[PDB]
Each structure stands twice: as structure tokens, then as C-alpha cells.
């Protein structure tokens, strides 16, 4: 309702008033693309991004949650988020002290990567690939779950982007994730590998060298029917 005042309250020194504005803003950000558009028209994005460079970890956590929800908008809305300078503060956050902040920053990056190839290129230029690949082994299964999703979306980009992903060393941790304890992680890793398997013969050669083929074949004896099917589809996409 009173969006410009809430956007103004995003600059309030009073943290109670700020968090009150952040909660209202976040509820709008998760209300779909028409609601996200209202946040954009109210000039919410720049003040929102500015909060990623804040003293309070909780304010950062709340602002990234809202950014992740805005990043789930259409390609034009994702573009407005990039223009507001969201990429650099998000990439810096992949090395943050808080695991919950990392999870949300990876979630935001995964949503940005679900946009067009120009927006995937913007993530690559902001240097998202190296810290994302680094996160493919970082303790938390929930963090890995976010990181694989981001990488799978990046892997659906053009051949130059897939090559950039391979250069950042994505293949060895992805192949190891085909034998991860979590079934959801396996499915995600298969999706990422199937996207890499889609494209030119140079990328297919790289997957074969990484050991994706026996790892995909081992999944043909997995208890889950959907995992077997996706692994077979990934091997078909390779042949």
C-alpha cells in the first residue's frame, strides 16, 4: 500500500523501523512478478542492495531473502536487479561468516542464473563461478543443494559459458556429487551434468575425462526410479 514510505524506512537508523520495512518489502517480493514490479516502480531495489553492506547480519539476511525473491521475477525484473548493482554484493557474500546468508546469496544467484544468457554472462563477469564451485564441497548439504542449482542454471547457458564453468573446475566436484549421501543433490548434479552434456563435442569430451560416464552408469542401479531415468537421459544427451 504505502511502498515509497517503506522504501524510505530502508534508510532509517532505527533497526526496529528498518526490519519492519524489510518484512513488508519481503512479503511483496514473494507475492509474484506483479508484486515485484510494484517494488521496482517504487525504487526499492537500489536501497535494498545497499543493505548488503550493513553492520547487522540479520538485516543482510532479511535483504538477501527479499533479493532472492525479486530474482525469481521475469528476465526484465532480473535485469533491473543487476542494474541496481546486486551481483558484486551477492558474490562477496559467498564467503560470509554466516551459513544462512551464504544459502540465501546462492539462492539469489541461482534465480539470477535462471534468467537469459546475458544475465548468466553478468554473473560470470562478477566472478560468481569460482566461489560457487568452492561451495560444491562446503560442509552444509543445504548449501551444496543451492550451489548445484546455480551451476545447473549456468550450465544451460551458451557454450562459452559452459566452457567458463569447466575452467572454474565445476566437473570434478559435480561428478563426486553423483555419489552424494542426499538424493536431492544427486538429481541436481545429474541435471547440471545433463545440461553440460547438451551442447558441443568439446564439453562432452571434458565430461568423459572427469569420469561422469561410470558415475552416471552407477546411477542406473539407484533405488529411485526418477534418478535412474534422469541419469539415462543424461547419458542419452551425451550420445
Amino acid at each position: 500500500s504505502e511502498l515509497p514510505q517503506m522504501v524510505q524506512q530502508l534508510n532509517s537508523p532505527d533497526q526496529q523501523e528498518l526490519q519492519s520495512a524489510l518484512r513488508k518489502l519481503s512479503q511483496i517480493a514473494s507475492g509474484g512478478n506483479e508484486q515485484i514490479q510494484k517494488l521496482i516502480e517504487a525504487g526499492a531495489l537500489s536501497p535494498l542492495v545497499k543493505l548488503l553492506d550493513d553492520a547487522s547480519e540479520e538485516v543482510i539476511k532479511e535483504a538477501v531473502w527479499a533479493i532472492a525473491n525479486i530474482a525469481s521475477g521475469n528476465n526484465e525484473q532480473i535485469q533491473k536487479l543487476i542494474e541496481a548493482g546486486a551481483l558484486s554484493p551477492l558474490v562477496k557474500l559467498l564467503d560470509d561468516a554466516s551459513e544462512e546468508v551464504i544459502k540465501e546469496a546462492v539462492w539469489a544467484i541461482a534465480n539470477i542464473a535462471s534468467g537469459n544468457n546475458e544475465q548468466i554472462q553478468k554473473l560470470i563477469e562478477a566472478g560468481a563461478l569460482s566461489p560457487l564451485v568452492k561451495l560444491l564441497d562446503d560442509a552444509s548439504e543445504e548449501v551444496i543443494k543451492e550451489a548445484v542449482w546455480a551451476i545447473a542454471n549456468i550450465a544451460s547457458g551458451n557454450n562459452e559459458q559452459i566452457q567458463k564453468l569447466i575452467e572454474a573446475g565445476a566437473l570434478s566436484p559435480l561428478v563426486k556429487l553423483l555419489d552424494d549421501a542426499s538424493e536431492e543433490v544427486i538429481k541436481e548434479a545429474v541435471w547440471a551434468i545433463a545440461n553440460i552434456a547438451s551442447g558441443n563435442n568439446e564439453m562432452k569430451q571434458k565430461l568423459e575425462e572427469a569420469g561422469a560416464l561410470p558415475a552416471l552408469e552407477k546411477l542406473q542401479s539407484h533405488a529411485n526410479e526418477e534418478v535412474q531415468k534422469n541419469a539415462q537421459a543424461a547419458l542419452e544427451a551425451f550420445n
Partner: peptide
């Protein structure tokens, strides 16, 4: 090829 939003 497959792109997907991460939703909750």
C-alpha cells in the same frame, strides 16, 4: 537444456 527458478 533446462533452466529452473529456485522457489520456496
Amino acid at each position: 537444456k533446462r533452466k529452473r527458478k529456485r522457489k520456496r
